[model samples]
Target: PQITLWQRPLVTIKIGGQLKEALLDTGADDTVLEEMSLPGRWKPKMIGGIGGFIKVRQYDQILIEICGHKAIGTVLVGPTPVNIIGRNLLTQIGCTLNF
Candidate 1:
């Protein structure tokens, strides 16, 4: 599937039956979501952003469906203005930036 760059690359993603919108952030290393109580184990982690480093919970091997495409990897839960689908999952779903 192809995406246009005229606006923010936001897509519908499903996580454990819950649906939300996330941005395809080519600049991000890992996916980050807004605060939520998800099943399974998580660890304390810190991620650096423009605002500086922020504490987050790292959940591993979690399955998420991005625009109908599925992927399972590490997803960080924290305080972000919006959910982000980063390079880690982007590469899995074959997402790339085309000029």
Candidate 2:
């Protein structure tokens, strides 16, 4: 069985100065960002998903500083405001979630 890391939480995320809290979900396969919510210089690309192939885009690494630690990674721009912190993020941060 896959080890679970981090409990899911509906946390608020401020993207490019836009505030959108109460978003549902915690760990996602990919952290998809809304195209409209992105700033200048971030381009998007199409990618595949379980449902079907999606328009996956590239994004700039934002400064997400938490617990005195910071993370920087390219996000996918899609039709959602929730930033998914999937296994990739958890592994990188050496965090394990207990459900």
Candidate 3:
């Protein structure tokens, strides 16, 4: 199945207190940060989460704008700096899914 932009809501979100554009995805259930933007963008304290083995670093939440929508959420400071919208935010905003 091919999913197009029309079928999904893609928004630009900022992570790690940095004003950068990110593709917000409803399909993504968790917040993500790519390796490139991880270092300077994030300051870490500890690492460990749901899996008990996965590294979970706390970061400052940046302002994100998504199609006239705005939100604040911390980015998990880590390697590979890729910003994701995640399902937590997506569910808040109502969307229609069509295949």
Candidate 4:
């Protein structure tokens, strides 16, 4: 199948010559990916959830594509439960939800 969707919308993202699977989490405010190194510069940044805040590396101007649409923006790398494609990156994609 070329597409799949659910309550937890899992999508394939193309970044830096590899396709990484991540959750398109509408609940999350920013794009959070598991700890890893990416090309370019990054700085220490903080991200929060229901409980507490977590520190992550803020890599700006990263070119990552989702569903064939490319979004060049800040990608936060940290110890996340799973890769989350939050609104920070989501807003750039042509992805839309209507109900």
- The prediction achieving the highest TM-score against the true structure is 1
| lDDT of candidate 2 at residue 4, scale 0 to 100 | 39
Worst 10 residues of 4 by lDDT: 1-10
Best by lDDT: 1
lDDT of 4 by residue, 1-99 (tens): 234454568889998888889998778888988977899778998888978999999999999888778999999999988999999888887555666
In the range 9-97, model 3's lDDT, one tens digit per residue, is: 44545444555555566555656555434433555544344444445465565444555566555556454245565665555544445
Candidate 2 local lDDT, residue 99: 55
How many clashing pairs does model 3 include? 8
* lDDT at position 27, candidate 2: 39
Q: Which regions of candidate 1 fall more than 4 Å away from where they truly are?
A: none
* CA RMSD of each candidate after superposition: 0.8, 5.1, 6.1, 2.4
Per-model tally of clashing residue pairs = 0, 8, 8, 0
Give per-residue lDDT, candidate 3, residue 67.
54
lDDT assessment of candidate 2? 0.53
Ranking of models by TM-score: 1, 4, 2, 3
- Relative to the unseen true structure, what is the C-alpha lDDT of residue 26 in candidate 3, on a scale of 0 to 100? 57
lDDT of 3: 0.52
Error of 2 at 96 (Å): 1.2
What Cα-based lDDT does every candidate model obtain? 0.93, 0.53, 0.52, 0.85
